[PDB]
């Protein structure tokens, strides 16, 4: 799915129960489709497929990895005192059960030693409150329990969990516009999202940009010249235009990994699937009944939400 750069990355993270040798939609029991405490940090608890296959198609956590034994593994910090005194271990699902994993902070003092403070923790697939002396592990990573779709929602704590799935599904539908603008408020994951989307020109060699053109970019390094071909008004699988624009000017040095050009729905190296417009929350003469929006003509005559769509016909 190449409707937008986000779809290309979120498509490859799907884990499916239904398939050859797996539970069919009808076959799947209710139990199969609910979160199990084991899914913490390894699977997304708010990304599913809406329909008859609800709870059967899910995404994969941001920090997860697949293990030697075929098991998804998650990164847990070890607060236990040792020689190194710090570790990041990808504990497997069965191993983390026999550990006191506390996700809370330590900013509490009650005239006693700090290790005597209490904190919610997880043990044997349960929740309980224990002292800081007895907690073996700690989950520090903020994006550990979510996926790319949910993590792009700012202030997700103040939103209901039910609407999170709707927002994740609707972020997938965005159309790349003729012009792109970054978001004033963001979660900070748009950078790596645009980096790993694949619609960005990243240099594979250090050097200087000797020649700049719309069709190609010439990068001269270590006595060798490399040519990078750009994309000019191509067509995706979902009838959405793909285009790239140069970001670096002529005569600047670029390392192996930096951004040479900006693809569609990406500006300054960050994912940009929309625009920033002034909004007021009030009823206006019924035009807002149910859900409906009243918009001004400025969005029309200034090309704020203009988009290009390309459809192919072949005989």
């Amino acid at each position: 799915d190449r409707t937008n750069p986000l779809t290309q990355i979120v498509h490859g993270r799907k884990l499916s129960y239904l398939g050859p040798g797996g539970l069919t939609g009808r076959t799947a029991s209710f139990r199969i489709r609910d979160i199990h405490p084991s899914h913490y940090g390894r699977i997304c608890p708010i990304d599913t497929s809406e329909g008859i296959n609800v709870g059967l198609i899910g995404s994969l956590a941001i920090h997860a990895r697949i293990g030697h034994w075929g098991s998804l593994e998650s990164p847990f910090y070890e607060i236990s005192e040792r020689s190194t005194g710090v570790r990041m271990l990808y504990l497997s699902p069965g191993r983390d059960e026999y550990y006191m994993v506390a996700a809370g902070n330590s900013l509490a003092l009650n005239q006693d030693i700090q290790e005597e403070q209490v904190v919610p923790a997880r043990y044997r697939q349960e929740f309980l409150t224990i002292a800081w002396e007895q907690v073996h592990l700690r989950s520090i990573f903020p994006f550990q329990y979510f996926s790319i779709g949910a993590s792009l929602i700012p202030f997700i704590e103040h939103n209901d969990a039910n609407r999170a799935l709707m927002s994740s599904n609707m972020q997938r539908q965005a159309v790349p516009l003729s012009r792109s603008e970054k978001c004033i408020v963001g979660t900070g994951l748009e950078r790596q999202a645009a980096l790993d989307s694949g619609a960005l020109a990243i240099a594979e060699r250090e050097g200087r940009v000797v020649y700049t053109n719309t069709d190609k970019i010439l990068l001269a390094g270590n006595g060798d010249i490399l040519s990078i071909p750009l994309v000019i008004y191509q067509r995706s699988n979902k009838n959405t235009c793909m285009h790239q624009k140069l970001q670096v000017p002529r005569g600047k040095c670029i390392k192996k990994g930096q951004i040479l050009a900006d693809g569609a729905a990406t500006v300054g190296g960050e994912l940009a699937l929309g625009k920033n417009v002034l909004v007021a929350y009030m009823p206006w003469e019924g035009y807002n009944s149910e859900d409906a929006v009243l918009i001004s003509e400025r969005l029309v005559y200034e090309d704020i939400y203009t988009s290009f769509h390309i459809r192919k016909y072949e005989i």
């Binding site: 139990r31 199990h36 084991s38 699977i43 034994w69 075929g70 098991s71 699902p93 069965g94």
Partner: protein, 63 residues
């Protein structure tokens, strides 16, 4: 052959639940494994056991 065609993963899991010292390499349904299975089964009747959750990730593999 298909019932005894336990994978390497299968061997490991069998060893975990039923304490066995069978080497990882011998990925076959040995009769000791069956014997042990029977032992645990009878032990479950007297309370010395724990049933297994089939929705646990540790009980699932990713292809």
């Amino acid at each position: 052959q298909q019932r005894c065609e336990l994978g390497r993963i299968g061997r490991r899991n069998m060893n975990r639940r039923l304490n066995l010292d069978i080497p990882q390499n011998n990925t076959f349904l040995l009769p000791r494994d069956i014997l042990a299975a029977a032992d645990h089964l009878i032990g479950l009747k007297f309370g010395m056991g724990a049933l297994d959750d089939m929705n646990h990730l540790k009980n699932k593999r990713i292809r």
